[PDB]
Every structure is written in C-alpha cells, then in structure tokens.
Amino acid sequence: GRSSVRPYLEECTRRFQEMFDRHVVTRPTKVELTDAELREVIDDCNAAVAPLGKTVSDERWISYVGVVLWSQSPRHIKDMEAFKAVCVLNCVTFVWDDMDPALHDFGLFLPQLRKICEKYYGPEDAEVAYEAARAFVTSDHMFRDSPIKAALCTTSPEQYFRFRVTDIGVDFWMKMSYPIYRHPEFTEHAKTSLAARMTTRGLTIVNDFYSYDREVSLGQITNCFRLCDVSDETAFKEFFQARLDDMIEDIECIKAFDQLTQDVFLDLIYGNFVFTTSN
Amino acid sequence: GRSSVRPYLEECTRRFQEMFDRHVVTRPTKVELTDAELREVIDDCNAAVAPLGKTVSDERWISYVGVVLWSQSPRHIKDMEAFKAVCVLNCVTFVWDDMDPALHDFGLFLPQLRKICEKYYGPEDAEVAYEAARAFVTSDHMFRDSPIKAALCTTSPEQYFRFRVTDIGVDFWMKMSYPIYRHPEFTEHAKTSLAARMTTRGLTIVNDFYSYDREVSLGQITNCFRLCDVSDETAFKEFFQARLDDMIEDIECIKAFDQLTQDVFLDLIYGNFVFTTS
Ligand SMILES: [Mg+2]
Ligand SMILES: [Mg+2]
Ligand SMILES: [Mg+2]
Ligand SMILES: [Mg+2]
C-alpha cells in the first residue's frame, strides 16, 4: 500500500514538467564528450575503483555519468578539465555508494579521490574538491544505521532536507563544479554552501519521488515521501503539492541571483529531472 | 522602522529561559581566561586590526569576546590554543562587521586572519579556519545591498534561516571551533556544516529578538522578526511561538547526536542566550 508511488507516476511526472515549463522555461542541454574525453573519463574511473577489486563495465559508467552530462550548464562551461573531474568524481562516488559498506576501504579509496582532484584541478581547487568528496563519503559511512539519520529523516521535511544538503551530495557537487565556470559569485555561493542549500529541495524531491519504490523495498529511510501516507491518495497529493510549493519558492528565490549563477542552479535542478525521467 | 519589541522584552526573556530549562537543563559555564591569556588575545586582536588604522579599546574587545567565553563547552575543551584563536577570530570579525564598509580593505585584513590561524592551529585546521573566515567576510561584503539578501530575508522563515547559516556566522564558528575539542564526530559535523545547520535557528532567533530595535532603526533587514507585524500583539505572539517551536524541534533532534557533540551544540545555543541577555 505504502510500498509504491506507481499510481502517481504519470501525473507527478506531468506536474513536475508543467512546473518547470512555467517557472524555469529554459530547457537543459546535453554536454557532448568526444570519444577521447569519454574513454579518458572511464579510464580514470576504472583506475580509481580497481584497488577495491571492483570491475565496472563501460555502459554502467555511462549510465552513471549521464547526470553530469545533463545537469551542468553548457552555456557557461569554461574549463573542461574541471568538467571531466566532475564526471569522474560523480561516477566513482556512485560506485562507492553502491557497494556493500564492508567493502569500503577508505585507505584504498581516498587517495584515488585525491589523485583525480590533483590531476584536473589547480592546487587550491584540488583541495576544495577533495575535502568535499572526503566529507561526503565520510558522511555516508558514519550515518549508516545512525540514530541521527532516523531523527532527521522522520521528524519533519525541514529536518530531512537539512540532512540531505550533504547526504544527497549537492554540496559536494557544488564544491567540485565551480571550477568549470570560473565565475566569482558562483564560486563564493558554492564555498559558503548557499549554492547547495538553494538547490537541495529541487534535487531531493525529484530524486526521492523516482527512487521511492526501490528505496523503501530496500528498507532505506532517506526519502521525503516516507513522511506521508503514500497509500492515501488525498494525503499523498497534499504532500506532493507542498513539495511542489517548496520547489517553486526555491526557484523564485534563485532568480534573485546573478544571471550566470541562476542559470547554473536551474539547469542543475531541471537537468536532473530530465536525466532522472529518461532511460 | 519605528517598531519595537520592547512590550515583549520581559515575557520573551522569561519564555526563552523556561524553554531552555525544560529542554536543555544543563547550564552553560563561563570560560575564565588567565590574565596572560586575555592579554595575548587582546594583543593579537589589536595587531590584526592595526592595518585598518582605527583603534579598539580593551573594554570593547572584552565585550566582544564574552560570547566565546560563555558559548563554548568547557567540560570538553582539549586545546586552548584553538580556544584563543576563536576568541581572536570572533573579536576581530566583530570589529570588521562593525565598520563602515567603505574602509573594508581586504588586502590588509585577510593576511591578518591568515596570521591568526597559522599561529594557533595545526596546518590542516589552519586552512579550514582561515577558509571559513574568508568565506564569512566575503559573504558579508557581497550581500550588503544585494537583491539576494532582500529575497532570502523577506520571503519566508525558511529562506531567511537558509541565508543565516552563513550570514550569522555559525558555520564559520563551527569550522574554527572543532579543534578546541578534537572530537572526531564533531569535527565531521562541523566540516559538512550539519553542525551549523542544527544550531542556526536557536542562535539566530535569540540574536534577532534582542537586536531587533537596533537593527530596524538602522534600516537593516537581516532579522526574522521583520517577517511578522510586531505591533500586532496577536500576530507577534503567534510568530514568536512558531520560532520557539523551531528551537524546540532542533534541540530535540540535536539530542540524537553523540553526547559530546550535543553538549557542544546546546551549550552554544544556551550560552549564546545567556551572553546576549547579560
Ligand atoms: Mg546515499
Ligand atoms: Mg534516492
Ligand atoms: Mg551581520
Ligand atoms: Mg542581529
């Protein structure tokens, strides 16, 4: 009953798209990697997870990298080495998040993350990106089975989204993506985490809706829709409307930011939705 | 702008204390600096702000440093070099927030912050502390008269507190304070800024109430109580109770953290109340 949002899948997808068309208007665009770039990305991905003895096929990597291809802001890219680092860091932390946690060898993995950062970023940016990656995968480790997670995720939407600012990876995302754009204001918003805080709900609500069935079947509690009775059409749709209102207020405030910054923020939110709803 | 929360000053003070007595219980305790340590701190503060030309008296310094003496967690302190750094970094960024922006010389001030961090912290912590200080003062600068400040501060409690995570300085505070304690869990929560997100509303709500009259008289908008009509006793009491409920919910979640970490969070919120009402 509460095991599935399947009855709402089409309507909610329509409503998400309708909101974006009214409030963001500009559609997201795909980044094309040359086959050299893509093999380079994938090679780095393989080298970084090999110490954990894990093999991962090219097409699995390409499914992982799709979110980065779709959710950056191609208008504004200025550094494609930073872009590739984000492709790599995203994919390997994807692979890390999808392993038995008693296969997690930090001594083996963290230095691979540092090597990626040092390859693609300047000296200062390498440290910023690496600390963000370190802090993300460290958060993930220390909150498995944590009473803190249960408290933040079951108490209120406000407590849950506060947890997700880090846990969904959007602070990590912002802190390794600002070198792509070299835009002073965006760099500051990324480093204060305001960038992450402005985009967390737009990203998390979409992510949660389309992974609800999988996550609750796996016993996972990091999902906002577990806060309403999904089996109750009236309660579900009041909750979903509240989440839509959350996304709209965020997007309306995001438009107070400078133009380039707001472009990146909205391409992220809307691009993630497009990527999420594709094959 | 000609508004005031004076008619509620007593009752809100009593309501605040009562909430803390029921939900935190543990009293905050003042850190007493020896005479040598207070001198070392004032000397460092005076050095840091000497390049900006203007003078700060001992008594102002000591009024600034009191929030640090009261709002840390004394039973858990392990590193007093780190503690002194927070005294100095708090005081001088206070003085900087208190200056006409027309005199905000970053090229003079940022090396002084870096100097403080390099004297008191290990090399890794010194970069964390410095970067949070840099990000804090840079945020203050780019949001003065910025349309983003006006949109975040006037739209809803949620957008306003989202802005204050950085703007009230608690993220900076966490990221320079964790070396005081060398507690692994607290260090991570500081570095993910979860520590700052848990404590922002309890700090900001207290700070906003007791600075409201001052701030509205100066045309400042960074105060959540501008979001209700404080001249409407009925509206103010509903808004004030909403913010108490926010503090209570946060405090109750804070107690799900490990025992040392939660002591630090709650001593910070409760000690800030004590210092503000002192
Ligand atoms: Mg995860
Ligand atoms: Mg998910
Ligand atoms: Mg201020
Ligand atoms: Mg104030």
Swiss-Prot record, chain A:
Mg(2+) 2 binds at residue 97. Mg(2+) 1 binds at residue 97. Its cofactor is Mg(2+). A motif (NSE/DTE motif) lies at residues 207-215. Mg(2+) 3 binds at residues 207, 211, 215. Its EC number is 4.2.3.146. One of its GO terms (molecular function) is lyase activity. A motif (DDXXD motif) lies at residues 97-100. The Asp-Asp-Xaa-Xaa-Asp/Glu(DDXXD/E) motifs is important for the catalytic activity, presumably through binding to Mg(2+). Catalyzes the cyclization of the linear isoprenoid intermediate geranylgeranyl diphosphate to tricycclic cyclooctat-9-en-7-ol in the cyclooctatin biosynthesis pathway. Cyclooctatin is a potent inhibitor of lysophospholipase. Homodimer. 3,7,18-dolabellatriene produced by the Trp288Gly mutant has potential antibiotic activity against multidrug-resistant S.aureus (MRSA). This is Cyclooctat-9-en-7-ol synthase. It comes from Streptomyces melanosporofaciens. The gene is CotB2.
Swiss-Prot record, chain B:
The Asp-Asp-Xaa-Xaa-Asp/Glu(DDXXD/E) motifs is important for the catalytic activity, presumably through binding to Mg(2+). It is an enzyme of class 4 (lyase). Changing residue 136 to Y: Abolishes activity, no product. Coiled coil: none annotated. Mg(2+) 2 binds at residue 97. Catalyzes the cyclization of the linear isoprenoid intermediate geranylgeranyl diphosphate to tricycclic cyclooctat-9-en-7-ol in the cyclooctatin biosynthesis pathway. Cyclooctatin is a potent inhibitor of lysophospholipase. It comes from Streptomyces melanosporofaciens. It catalyses: geranylgeranyl diphosphate + H2O = cyclooctat-9-en-7-ol + diphosphate. A motif (NSE/DTE motif) lies at residues 207-215. Homodimer. It comes from the Bacteria. GO terms for molecular function: isomerase activity; lyase activity; metal ion binding. Changing residue 98 to E: Abolishes activity, no product. The keyword Lyase applies. Disulfide bonds: none annotated. Mg(2+) 1 binds at residue 97. Changing residue 94 to A/G: Produces R-cembrene-A. Keywords: Isomerase, Lyase, Magnesium, Metal-binding. Changing residue 136 to G/H/L/V: Produces cyclooctat-9-en-7-ol. Pfam families: Terpene_syn_C_2. Its cofactor is Mg(2+). A motif (DDXXD motif) lies at residues 97-100. This is Cyclooctat-9-en-7-ol synthase. Gene3D superfamilies: Farnesyl Diphosphate Synthase. Mg(2+) 3 binds at residues 207, 211, 215. Belongs to the terpene synthase family. 3,7,18-dolabellatriene produced by the Trp288Gly mutant has potential antibiotic activity against multidrug-resistant S.aureus (MRSA).
